[PDB]
Paper text:
RJ contains 12–15% protein, of which 82–90% are members of the major royal jelly protein family (MRJPs) that share high homology, and are designated MRJP1−95–7. Besides their nutritional role, MRJP1 is a key factor responsible for honeybee development. Interestingly, the MRJP1 oligomer reportedly comprises both MRJP1 and apisimin. Apisimin is a serine-valine-rich peptide exclusively found in honeybee and has the tendency to form oligomers.
Author numbering:
A (entry chain C), F (entry chain C): 37 to 77
B (entry chain B), G (entry chain B): 28 to 116, 118 to 119, 121 to 171, 174 to 182, 184 to 191, 195, 200 to 218, 221 to 241, ...
C (entry chain A), H (entry chain A): 23 to 196, 200 to 289, 292 to 432
D (entry chain D), E (entry chain D): 36 to 78
């Protein structure tokens, strides 16, 4: 689920917690691919 | 009691003629008198903001966009597509209303009227391809007059096999075009009410004028200009009615419906904006006023609702996508004071405007963040 | 109240019952047999939040392994397991060494966690003397521990005491002032970080009202002869808002009075009988909005400090017969990191709400096949927008981001 | 300075459906990052 | 799969002075990252 | 010096060391700005 | 003994006529015989790879680019700019050589020759703007013939006030154009040597042909085709010589110099590529052979050197920017076997080719990484 | 030799003299007065590298605080300060508990650091018995320590011993084999991880040659009656290359011989008198290129294992009269992280070279106002490209990245 990753990641960031680099990388990959598939570029 | 952020202001309209040489040639001629430029409709597509002008004497172009240039009056206008369509000697005479569809076609309701009365040419419906700025189709409105009263095409709605709808406030009827039949309809709901003909900042015998198609229910909401009622007709019908009467305390102005099913409408007396959710029942306790300003909202002549772009449906849950554009001229003054601000394009996020009010759509609070958008 | 019936707040964590990270199911069973951990006697008192930690404090009844906890990564059939903070060392009270019953928590500007240990067992029998602990959240180590002298912990005439509410005013990160309500004994302790001095205050505003001693939540009712609790310090006005538990009033005391010494004629403000029901826990946003739980209605109410304290400025902002039965705690946090240039784009403040079911504790009649304890949350601005509670909105950007967890 | 008006301008372009300048995108990304760097967001 | 021929193709465009497709740039960035993710580069 | 930052950062990465997020962010900022100023976009 | 990676191969050249209908109309006509298409020069700009064809009988266009389409022979060619410039009836007759300057202008040396001998039209120097694909200037070469011998403009070099240089192998001289004077020069160094007229895979009385301007020293290196010498003339002179004689063991073919000062040249006998650094002294112990292949390097008809882009000078230290493009037809066969590969565009990184050899430029090893580039 | 006179390798770290991170200049001065740290007696034996750590081992003379070190963040007038690894606990040898003189280091596939402690003081007097330590680099803790029995640490007849070279063959990360050259005693110890068994071998190939006992570096000369050192295991062929110090030969033994037990008729290979001068330290790339220091020429030479072992396949790849006077150590590392899909784009292997000035130690005549000890480095492929040492290049990508530190 991209949505659960996003939700999880943003919650980390806004909470002041240290944020997982792998979750950051993977979610960036998934958001981009979605944008690619929607002809955003 | 909200004010809405201004996107563009004018003391008076002015155009990009080329040089101040070419402007002055038009001022002397009477092709352009600044005192006779009154906006009818606005719309928006990509970087373009359309502004249509009622073709009185001294109005160089009717169909315009806002340009990069600026004057003492405010942003200069620039004719769309080029000055070629500004000419009428019955070639766009008076772009009364605009509409943009799913396929990036711009629909234009040219009334044919000069000074909003004398029909110099026959009305027509133009259709430009916004990708190219070129004209795809032009159609004359025969449908166009009452056939008994004899009588102004003053409202538009468009549904990629498309269907257009054109209200006639003077003649009191509803033209229905099929993408090539036309057909004029009639009703007592389309007729003006003498009771609400006076609209007292500080008389108009016009009917159906203030249309708005719901993208979720397919009801075309409307009312006569002289009325305090909100009627509607379902469009699945479209070969020959709903809504409460006297439901509002004053006259309504222009109207618009969100994809999410919220109807917005201008309240003439209060100089306010009201709303009503389609999910609720049409009655007093479900009608709320969402913004008001004695200076800025004197006659809401137009409203449009747009969705933030690009449209990536997976992320819809994170974004309040819909925003409203509001043209508020001062029709009451159409005896203006041109050292003051007269014509305004405001905007706002739809969800922010109605949140925690009877107008709202139910909030699923299911994300750690929500982004509100407007321009 | 209008336009908001059954509006719930998104759940962050739920429990059917509390359970802990003992280590393995081996180490748990050793505690269940011992009577160190009965799941039926675990009732949450307070919550708080710092970085990745969500604190959850438990009333120290018989069968409550630790009082001061955080939510762990592990999960059970009850819900998220708890894990003692800092370590199990502070869970022990046979010794009477550290933390009997963490009644309330508070986090200050300088990342210190303040803890109000009441010393009570079963919320009544005072096994040890109360104390105020102060941990450094960066290290998880203890900075200072101070006993609350019997002189001020209890009422001198009656001898009764239950320290049930806490608020902290970090004036300079180093001269801070703590405030501790005593609902049973009916008094307000005022502590000074500089001296370690204490001062017990009294008032008729701190006293319980017999008129509003009966409180009905979700059909079932109980009775509570308790005074001052539900404290909340305004970061903008310095008013410490409060009310007796058995009351329908909202009082307050300005704390600038306590700054200049020699007070121990204090002036108390606020309307009486201003609410239709009793108020529970309370919190104030940095932006000056007071939130409070409405016991009878099982609702959350608000009031802006910019407006005048009266009925027409009080609105109820959420309500739910299932999810909001006793709002035992509330805190408000700002989204992080704090990048001031971008403040204009962000509704930064959000609220955390602990909603146990105190009505079911009183009668010892829980249904542990149902959800009982909830941490909800919401964006502050989204909750009050277009209501009498809102602060004026400057709509000056093409976008605005609302945050919570 | 004046990152706010650039941001506002850029987001308005994006949400309006318009084509968006790659240089304005790059420069605003540079400015947002630097601000975050100076606020110890990565430290 | 076939990230290598995309990379080769893309870099050849860049070094040749040619204008380079934003979609090919985005997709190749996506593929390089995912490869790095799967190789525990961030773990 | 952008060059010293680059050199320092790449040396970290290739050495197997953990790599500073601030040095990563700042060097990304400087490379971009250079590219911006050279009309690369 | 390196082979260089192939970028494009051909068994024979073919063109994008439009449809196989339009091709067959040309084959029957004799407008296009595949057996008579021989490449003269290559070049490269952005996505375009230029390929020029010697205009024999059966050669539809002379100035071409490689297209996206592909045939049994190899990549089809496509006339540049359009088919308009493919026509000669003296309108580009025979694009002998190409050159690209700092300002994205493409210089073309049209010889005017048909079958590389009969001068159907006068020679000319064209100059296209590569940004627009349109022609900026055209100039006839008067300069063009020996004025005693009577006699083929077969080499080109261009220096944004630009200076062009055109070798004449048959007439034995050096034309020097000023951006509008022309001027023919002469020398015994420009004359052919009878000793090295035979070039034995398994006779040519031509002179100056194989020019290459050093961007660092401004020496225009050259030699007669029939020679084993490397001469040069400094261009700061450019109103009326350097280099060793018999310095190479066999005849040299085309020539090119890197910005960094490395001269490359084809060695006819060995079917190899040699180099020499300008920083060293011109003598045997400083001449090295860097690549060789009996199949792939039979006649190096052209070489160009390009720098990797974009050019961001701050990062030059991280990048071996320069790469070489090599056209290797088989002039020895110009009796071909068209079931085999005959014409090749190879390439390589310059620094990788010469590193740790007497040709190299001194390496400052001052970064934890170095990137080598080619296409 | 050709086309490469005075070609130096980029310096990674330089020293005029070694100094340590004692804590503060207070704690340093306490050691200088004590005689625990004389800067004039610190001579580096080996280097290695793992993640952010660069190891530097010091010959334990009088005035050498720690033997096993890493380079620290701090810097002095001498150069980068050293810092004992793991902590100062292993620097102590009064006790004779841990690490007297870390002669050589080795890092295996599994992130274990192997250390050859000779037990020597002043590189001669055997204060303690030699041992082989094995730290886990992930934790900095010690996994195993093993004494090298006097049975195999010294020659049985003469009694002499100096363990001066080390190589490790991690066959399975858990069955590894260590190899330890003894230059003074002239033997090859072969250790087995499974048994902790040791076996001392002998050969005439391990013996010193009197003919090449004189070695001149940069004008000044000295004499060395030492045998087998300069070992290097090929990861591709399993040949353990070596040579006696006083020799101009390059020998080797295949190690598959040692796999099957019962060897303790071993077969030694390699040409004799193949070099014009003595070879110093040695290293082999994963790709099969052997590098070696050439003592006389103050140069680095190479030879590809794919080619035949003879003069026309030996080339000198760098040389410098100032910077390469005695190559005391060499290691080869691959660039990280290892992402195999992208291997085609990257020349991954790079070489680290310790070049002290052993010629100046012998005569006790250093100039500490000059640079004396250097860690250089270079990309392997860039060093040998277009030379007889290279491996065949597949030029199959529009770009190739060369790496070092
Ligand atoms: C990992 C992240 C950050 C996600 C960021 C990099 C995403 C989100 C939206 C993307 C832009 C969308 C539109 C556009 C408009 C388009 O024209 C250019 C790309 C851009 C700006 C996208 C680029 C990438 C963005 C900003 C979160 C979840 C912590
Ligand atoms: C707070 C910020 C900037 C936040 C930025 C990344 C936000 C703002 C608006 C977002 C787009 C809105 C709608 C949409 C519509 C949706 O369909 C795609 C994402 C997009 C383009 C959003 C992408 C993310 C944007 C640009 C800085 C100051 C740190
Ligand atoms: C819509 C998106 C992703 C939007 C992302 C880039 C948004 C969301 C929350 C934002 C942070 C909120 C608060 C803050 C607090 C403020 O102090 C700094 C910005 C920051 C961290 C925002 C940064 C941008 C965030 C992460 C996709 C799905 C298209
Ligand atoms: C140019 C853009 C996109 C801006 C994007 C790339 C910026 C904005 C905020 C950044 C995150 C903030 C905090 C954080 C928290 C930190 O812990 C990790 C980086 C992250 C998530 C930032 C990454 C990049 C973000 C999303 C818009 C205006 C079109
Ligand atoms: C699309 C591109 C650009 C690809 C770029 C963004 C990729 C490539 C490798 C990535 C780093 C690898 C390791 C690492 C090590 C890790 O510790 C941090 C990220 C970093 C530096 C990666 C970041 C992103 C890099 C540079 C080309 C083909 C035009
Ligand atoms: C921080 C990093 C990674 C730096 C990376 C993100 C840089 C380097 C080159 C950049 C591209 C150059 C050209 C181009 C061509 C241009 O058309 C698009 C951008 C692109 C691909 C640049 C984008 C950013 C790149 C890949 C290192 C130092 C660890
Ligand atoms: C190893 C990689 C890809 C590395 C990528 C980011 C490298 C390769 C070539 C580089 C450009 C070369 C020249 C130049 C010329 C210089 O002027 C600007 C940078 C640029 C465009 C380089 C940018 C970085 C590139 C694209 C993956 C597989 C992890
Ligand atoms: C030229 C640049 C920056 C180029 C950057 C993106 C290059 C350099 C080294 C590359 C890593 C080398 C090895 C490796 C080893 C390999 O296993 C993964 C890729 C990685 C980490 C490369 C990634 C890309 C890097 C960081 C700017 C100045 C324009």
């Amino acid at each position: 689920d991209v949505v659960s990753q996003i939700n999880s990641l943003v919650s980390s960031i806004v909470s002041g917690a240290n944020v997982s680099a792998v979750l950051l990388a993977q979610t960036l990959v998934n958001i981009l691919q979605i944008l690619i598939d929607a002809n955003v570029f | 009691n909200k004010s809405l952020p201004i996107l563009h202001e004018w003391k008076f309209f002015d155009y990009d003629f080329g040089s101040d040489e070419r402007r002055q040639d038009a001022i002397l001629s009477g092709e352009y008198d600044y005192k006779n430029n009154y906006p009818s409709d606005i719309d928006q597509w990509h970087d373009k903001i359309f502004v249509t002008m009622l073709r009185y004497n001294g109005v160089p172009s009717s169909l315009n966009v806002i340009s990069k240039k600026v004057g003492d009056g405010g942003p200069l206008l620039q004719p769309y597509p080029d000055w070629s369509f500004a000419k009428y000697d019955c070639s766009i005479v008076s772009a009364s209303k605009l509409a943009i569809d799913k396929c990036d076609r711009l629909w234009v309701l040219d009334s044919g009227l000069v000074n909003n009365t004398q029909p110099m040419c026959s009305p027509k419906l133009l259709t430009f391809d916004l990708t190219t700025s070129q004209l795809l189709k032009q159609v004359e409105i025969p449908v166009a007059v009452n056939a008994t009263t004899g009588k102004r095409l003053s409202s538009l709605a468009v549904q990629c096999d498309t269907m257009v709808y054109i209200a006639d406030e003077k003649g009191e009827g509803l033209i229905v075009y099929h993408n090539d039949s036309f057909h004029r309809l009639t009703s007592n709901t389309f007729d003006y009410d003498p009771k609400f003909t006076k609209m007292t900042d500080g008389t108009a015998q016009d009917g159906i004028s203030g249309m708005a198609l719901s993208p979720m229910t397919n009801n075309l909401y409307y009312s006569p200009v002289a009325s305090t009622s909100l009627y509607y007709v379902n469009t699945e019908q479209f070969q020959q009615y709903e809504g409460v009467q006297n439901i509002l305390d004053t006259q309504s102005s222009a109207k618009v419906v969100s994809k999410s099913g919220v109807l917005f409408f201008g309240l003439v007396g209060d100089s306010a904006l009201g709303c009503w959710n389609e999910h609720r029942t049409l009655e007093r306790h479900n009608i709320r006023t969402v913004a008001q300003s004695d200076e800025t909202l004197q006659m809401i002549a137009s409203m449009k609702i747009k969705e933030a772009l690009p449209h990536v449906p997976i992320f819809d849950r994170y974004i309040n996508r819909e925003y409203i554009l509001v043209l508020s001229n001062k029709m009451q003054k159409m005896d203006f004071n041109f050292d003051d601000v007269n014509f305004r394009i405001m905007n706002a996020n739809v969800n922010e405007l109605i949140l925690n009010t009877r107008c709202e759509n139910p909030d699923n609070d299911r994300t750690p963040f929500k982004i509100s958008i407007h321009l």
